[PDB]
């Protein structure tokens, strides 16, 4: 397996935005969960949505897009809070077990 991109490096938004990063990822024929965590890493979000545990209200998403090797990274009306490292994560779930990670993107939320 391939580490994922994660894009743009640096990300600026006004604390109320929108803010997405695109996840890029090309997968082999086997089976895969893409985790967003922001950085010890804390999971935002996944690809395919989780569906065992039961579901959870949140202001992150994750989305492939009809490409099927991008996938946004959303948060909705960001914080100032929310400013920090993130990243992308895949795991491979077979034929081995792995995590490759992206580097790290930044997001910047500044003051109205
Ligand atoms: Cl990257
Ligand atoms: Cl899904």
């Not at 009306?77 to 992206?102: F, H, M």
């Amino acid at each position: 397996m391939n580490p994922p991109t994660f894009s743009p490096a640096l990300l600026v938004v006004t604390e109320g935005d929108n803010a997405t990063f695109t996840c890029s990822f090309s997968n082999t024929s086997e089976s895969f969960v893409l985790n967003w965590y922001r950085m010890q890493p804390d999971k935002l979000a996944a690809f395919p949505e989780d569906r065992s545990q039961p579901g959870q209200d949140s202001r992150f998403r994750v989305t492939q897009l009809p490409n099927g090797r991008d996938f946004h990274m959303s948060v909705v009306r960001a914080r100032r809070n929310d400013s920090g490292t993130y990243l992308c994560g895949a795991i491979s779930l077979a034929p081995k077990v792995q995590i490759k990670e992206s580097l790290r993107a930044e997001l910047r939320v500044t003051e109205r």
